Structure 1
């Protein structure tokens, strides 16, 4: 009651905007992600360990288990398409992800790999809404491959429903 208190409602959004600009300008970056998919050319993404750690338990564990200040870390990623890694990094830096429906399985795989659970769930919910007789075997199959129990179940149930099971 003799205290001055102030909260800037959209501070975290504005600050994330500037951190995103610093990423795109390759300023203050302390991690290089090297992404090699099949025969596509290797892609390279600069980022900030603290931002990746703030968005992914997997990145957090890599960088904090590291129990050493050492500057530039290099993460070599195999068998994830670069565009998938671009979409996940942009998600960590912007809170948003947008893509064609054919991209969703691939992005979901990447999201599961880095335990970005909010993206995994949004991908899951979308794919459940897309279920049809043409796609439900693929979706069940993929969902089993990447360990997505809920998507695999919803896809199995949708199939068995056609047989009154």
Structure 2
């Protein structure tokens, strides 16, 4: 009747390119300003649809019906820069790495953005070192 085809690799390749576009600040449309205790701010550019695709919290926050018309800054307080960076990194690459003291703070950032995949992975490392 009909001919179809699926490339089983397409999502990995494309996130790859989207991660490239982020590192080069191309097509970005949100900057997260994270400010946390005394460490000065950081800025992260990213793509709102890529954030919303991995976090129900970023989904809800960016899908409200408002229109961008430029760059929206999101002030994000209550999380160390290094934890937001690794969580954006997970959004864009599906991987995440950390040492054993930061693994506590990463499960708190993942719970805050409902990145449940990371939450369960941390919660496993925490009982596999106890």
Same fold (TM over 0.5): yes
Specify the SS of the correspondent of 2:86. helix
Instruction: Count residues in correspondence.
Output: 129
Higher helix proportion (structure 1 or 2): 1
Query: Once the 2 structures are TM-superposed, how far is the Cα of residue 63 of structure 1 from its aligned partner?
Result: 0.8
What per-residue deviation string (whole Å, max 9, x for no partner) do you get for residues 57-111 of structure 1? 0000011114334331111111311010000000000000011111111011100
Higher strand proportion (structure 1 or 2): 2
In structure 2, the gaps of 5 or more residues are none
Q: Please, what TM-score do these two structures have when normalized by structure 2?
A: 0.94
Q: Following superposition of structure 1 onto structure 2, how do residues 24-39 of structure 1 map, counting pairs within 5 Å?
A: 24-39=23-38
What per-residue deviation string (whole Å, max 9, x for no partner) do you get for residues 108-152 of structure 1? 11001101011011010110111xxxxxxxxxxxxxxxxxxxxxx
In structure 1, the gaps of 5 or more residues are 131-165
Specify the SS of the correspondent of 1:70. coil
Q: Which moved more, 1:2-11 or 1:81-90?
A: 2-11
How far apart in 1 are the matches of 2:32 and 2:68?
18
The structure, 1 or 2, with the larger RCO (C-alpha pairs under 8 Å, 6+ apart) is 2
How far apart in 2 are the matches of 1:49 and 1:11?
20
Specify the SS of the correspondent of 2:63. helix
Specify the SS of the correspondent of 1:68. coil
CA gap 1:43/1:69 in 2 versus in 1, 3 angstroms: closer
How far apart in 1 are the matches of 2:26 and 2:105?
29
Query: Once the 2 structures are TM-superposed, how far is the Cα of residue 37 of structure 1 from its aligned partner?
Result: 1.7
What per-residue deviation string (whole Å, max 9, x for no partner) do you get for residues 18-76 of structure 1? 00000000000000000112111211000001000000000000111143343311111
How far apart in 2 are the matches of 1:85 and 1:69?
22
Tell me how large the CA RMSD over aligned residues is: 1.1
Q: Please, what TM-score do these two structures have when normalized by structure 1?
A: 0.75
